[PDB]
A paper describes a structure:
Mmi1 is an essential RNA-binding protein in the fission yeast Schizosaccharomyces pombe that eliminates meiotic transcripts during normal vegetative growth. A C-terminal YTH RNA-binding domain in Mmi1 recognizes UNAAAC motifs (where N is any ribonucleotide) that are present in multiple copies within DSRs. Surprisingly, Mmi1 binds DSR RNA using a divergent mechanism on a surface that is distinct from the m6A-binding pocket, including extended protein sequences located upstream and downstream of the YTH domain. We propose that the low-complexity region influences RNA binding indirectly by reducing dynamic motions of the RNA-binding groove and stabilizing a conformation of the YTH domain that binds to RNA with high affinity.
We also determined a structure of apo-Mmi1 residues 327–488. The core YTH domain of our structure of Mmi1-RNA is similar to apo-Mmi1 and to previously reported structures with a central five-stranded β-sheet surrounded by four α-helices. Interestingly, the low-complexity N-clamp region adopted a similar conformation in two structures of Mmi1 determined in the absence of RNA (this work and Ref. 21). Both apo- and RNA-bound structures have crystal-packing contacts in their N-terminal regions. Furthermore, structural alignments of all known Mmi1 YTH domain structures show that the core fold is highly similar (r.m.s.d. <0.5 Å), but the N- and C-clamps are more divergent. This observation is also consistent with higher relative B-factors in these regions.
Numbering used by the authors: 331 to 485
Amino acid sequence: RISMINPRVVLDENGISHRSRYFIMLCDNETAIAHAKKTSIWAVKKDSSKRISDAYKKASVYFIFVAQQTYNALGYAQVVSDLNSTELPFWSDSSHAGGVRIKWIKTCNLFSAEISEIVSHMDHGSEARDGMEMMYDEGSRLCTLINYAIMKRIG
C-alpha cells in the first residue's frame, strides 16, 4: 500500500503513514487560537486523547488548525510533548484530557476552497470531526495547500 501522491510513503490499512500522522483541530474560539499561537500549547479532548497520545509515542504527529465556522486555515504545528493533565491552557474545559506542547510550522488566517473541500469530506465523505486523524494524503495535501496559500498571499 503506497500513498497516491508520494510513491515513497508506505501506508497502513487505514491509509495512514507509519512515520507522519495528522490530526485536525477545529477551533471556534479566537482567544484559544491566539493564545496557542503565542504560547505553543494546545488542549487535547478526552475523546481523541488516547489515539493522539499513542501516535505521539510511535511517530511524528502534526495538528492542522482550521476554523470551525468557515474552514479557514489557521496553520499547522508538530506536537512536541505528550499529554499532561497539569499543563492545561486557561481556556480548556471539562472535555479536555490535558495539554500538549506544539512547535508551529505555519500560522495564518486565510481561506482556501481546496482546503475547505478536504475538511468537508474528511470523515469518509462527511464534515471533519474535531480531533480526528486524517489520511496521509489529506495531511500532506493540507500542509502543501497552507504553504502555497501563505506563499501566494505574500505577493
